[PDB]
Every structure is written in structure tokens, then in C-alpha cells.
Amino acid sequence: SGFRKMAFPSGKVEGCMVQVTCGTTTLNGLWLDDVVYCPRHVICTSEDMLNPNYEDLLIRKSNHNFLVQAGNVQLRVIGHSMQNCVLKLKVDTANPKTPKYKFVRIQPGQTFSVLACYNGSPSGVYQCAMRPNFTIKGSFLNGSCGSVGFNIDYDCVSFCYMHHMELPTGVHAGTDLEGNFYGPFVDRQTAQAAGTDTTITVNVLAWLYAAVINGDRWFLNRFTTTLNDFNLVAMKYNYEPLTQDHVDILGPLSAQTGIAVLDMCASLKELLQNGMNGRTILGSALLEDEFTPFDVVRQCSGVT
């Protein structure tokens, strides 16, 4: 037992990290098969980022201008193309460590692991969630761009995020691996504000189920509620509305604990209305929303 914010083992992704340099700009790239993926702003100078015309800036770059280094060895770039906000650098060598992989575009509320990198070298791994406002709250310093977010299903790595930007508020924005930004963000040094960062209700409920499985039960009450009644309270507290699809997804946790989904909703409602009163749940003094129902099942069952 015990319940932790857990990331996927990062080995499969560490074997894909490379350094990409274009002029004086250096960031991370993801090497899969014979293609290196990286943010297209690798071609920009600081002056370019105020209002970059990427198609125009890219005309001045040739294959030999993209310096790709995997560990201590240089890769030969034999092609380059821009797909949305990512550059795809075709190299002459397939990455021998390429895992089975997929590119997926996640939904708000979904979680993933990030392998934060600098100069193509991994520094750490942490668990994130795509916020309902399409930002992520990461830990990214200058040079971390090109670090990726991913999930793993046994031996298949599903890449879902590539880091591109930090908003003036310190929150993060990036793209899927086809180069499309999550949310309305653009790769330009222009002040872009995030929308409301609402709480992922279905994740909070999943985490309350993880708490009951792991021994923290003080918050369980004698009440029940309905979806409509719960949602009036969810709206008041800037929580995402709960749907029947979310109830369905929580079914396995409901079954395992014997606590009906709407009863857990009534516990959540009282926690929202009364607070924690100085108490903690799974060592947290706030309601955690960055564990999905699948994450709780995975951790509580021991999937490898």
C-alpha cells in the first residue's frame, strides 16, 4: 500500500533524447527511427521570437545547419521539414534504441510523465496533467524545450507532449508530436493568458477512491447526491462538470471499494463546502486532481 505521484519509468524515452542546435539556439530533440523531432523555434534568435515568420526563417536553413548530437556522437541530417510547430529532421541512422511508439493527442484531464532534459541529457522525471485550460504546470528552465510527455502501455511509448513555451504566469504550453499546440497558444514572445484552471473532478474522485483503498477514510460521509446537484456545487468551486461518462469510468473503483460513485460525490461535495479542517488525505492538504481513474487502478494493482 501507500499512494504516490508516480511517473512511468523513463528509460525508453531517455534512449531517444538528443541535442539539436541551429545557430546559437540549442534545445532537445526526440529521435525515433530516422527522424528527430524538435520545436521549430530552434531556428529562431531571441530577436526572431517577437514576431517570427517560420516559413521565411526556415528558407535560410539547410540540412547542415541543424546540428544533432546523440550523446557524444553527431548524426548526419539528410532532410528537414516543418509540420505545424515542430521540425522533423531526417537523419541517416535509425535510432537503435527506438521503442515501440505512437503519437497521441491527449484530452484535458489526462496525465502523463515528462522527462525534463537539457542539452539532450535527462535531468528528471515527473508526473503532469493536461489542465482543462490546455496548459501544464511543469518544471522547465531555458534549454528544456523539446523535452517530451508520454504514457507507456507495457512496451509501447505513447508520446503526447513536446515542451515549447513558458507563459508570463509561469505555466507551460506545448504541442502534441504532430506539432499542434494544446489550446490556443502560439510559439511567439507575445503575452498570451491562460483561461480558468478548473479542477478535474473525475480525477479528484479517483484519488478519493485511492485514499479509501489505502486507509484514509475520514472524509466518507452518510450522504449521497445526484449528478445535477453535485454539478451545482462543482460549478461554484470551479470544478469540471461531472458526466455519466466520468461515472462509468469510475465504475471499477466503485466496485472495488463498495462505495457508489454518487456517494463519493457527496463526500467530495462536503469537502468542498467545509474544507479539510486542518486534516490531510493521502498526505495532501488539498484535493489532488492529477491522477486519472486509470492511474489509480494501475498503481493500486501493480501494472508493469
Ligand X SMILES: *CC(=O)N1CCN(C(c2ccccc2)c2ccccc2)CC1
Inter-helix orientation angle 227-236/261-274, to 10°: 30
Q: Is 41 an annotated catalytic residue? A: yes
* Nearest distance, CB of residue 190 and ligand X, angstroms: 8
* Burial group, residue 76, by CB count within 10 angstroms (0-12, 13-18, 19+): exposed
From 7, 27, 87, 261, residue interacting with ligand X (rule: CB under 6 A): 27
From 214, 221, 224, 257, residue interacting with its own copies (rule: CB under 8 A): 214
From 69, 119, 127, 189, residue interacting with ligand X (rule: CB under 6 A): 189
Question: Which residue lies nearest ligand X, judged by its C-beta?
Answer: 145
Three-class secondary structure assignment of 13-38: HHCCEEEEEECCEEEEEEEECCEEEE
CB 111 within 8 A of CB 166: no
Task: Find which of its own copies, ligand X, none residue 119 binds, CB within 5 to 8 Å per kind.
Answer: its own copies
Q: Say how many residues make up the chain.
A: 304
Secondary structure of residue 5 in the 3-state scheme: coil
From residue 255, alpha-carbon distances to 161, 175, 213, 248, 263 in Å are 33, 36, 12, 11, 13
Binding mask 241-280 for its own copies (x = CB under 8 A): ----------------------------------xx-x-x
From 117, 129, 165, 206, residue interacting with ligand X (rule: CB under 6 A): 165
Window contacting its own copies (CB under 8 A); options: 36-44, 70-78, 114-122, 176-184: 114-122
Sheet with strand 77-83: strands edge to edge? 73-75, 66-70, 17-22, 25-32, 35-39, 86-91, 77-83
From residue 77, alpha-carbon distances to 41, 66, 98, 118, 130 in Å are 18, 7, 17, 21, 33
CB 293 within 8 A of CB 201: no
Q: Is 145 in the site for ligand X (CB under 6 A)?
A: yes
Q: Which is nearer to ligand X, 214 or 224 (CB)?
A: 214
Grid coordinates given for 299: 498503481
Grid coordinates given for 131: 489542465
Task: Find which of ligand X, its own copies, none residue 189 binds, CB within 5 to 8 Å per kind.
Answer: ligand X
The one-letter code for the residue type at 15 is G
Q: Is 115 in the site for ligand X (CB under 6 A)?
A: no
Task: Find which of its own copies, ligand X, none residue 21 binds, CB within 5 to 8 Å per kind.
Answer: none
Q: Is 163 in the site for ligand X (CB under 6 A)?
A: yes
Neighbours of 48 (CB within 10 A): 18
The Cα 237–Cα 286 span in angstroms is 13
Q: Is 118 in the site for its own copies (CB under 8 A)?
A: yes
Which residues, 30 to 89, sit near ligand X by CB under 6 A? 41, 44-46, 49
* Burial group, residue 2, by CB count within 10 angstroms (0-12, 13-18, 19+): exposed
Window contacting ligand X (CB under 6 A); options: 142-150, 220-228, 264-272, 290-298: 142-150
* Nearest distance, CB of residue 174 and ligand X, angstroms: 9
Q: Is 143 in the site for its own copies (CB under 8 A)?
A: yes
Q: Is 145 an annotated catalytic residue? A: yes
Q: Which position among 16, 22, 38, 145 bears the catalytic label?
A: 145
- Please identify every residue annotated as catalytic: 41, 145
Residues that bind its own copies (CB under 8 A): 1-12, 14-15, 115-119, 121-126, 137-141, 143-144, 166, 170-172, 214-215, 275-276, 278, 280, 283-286, 298-304
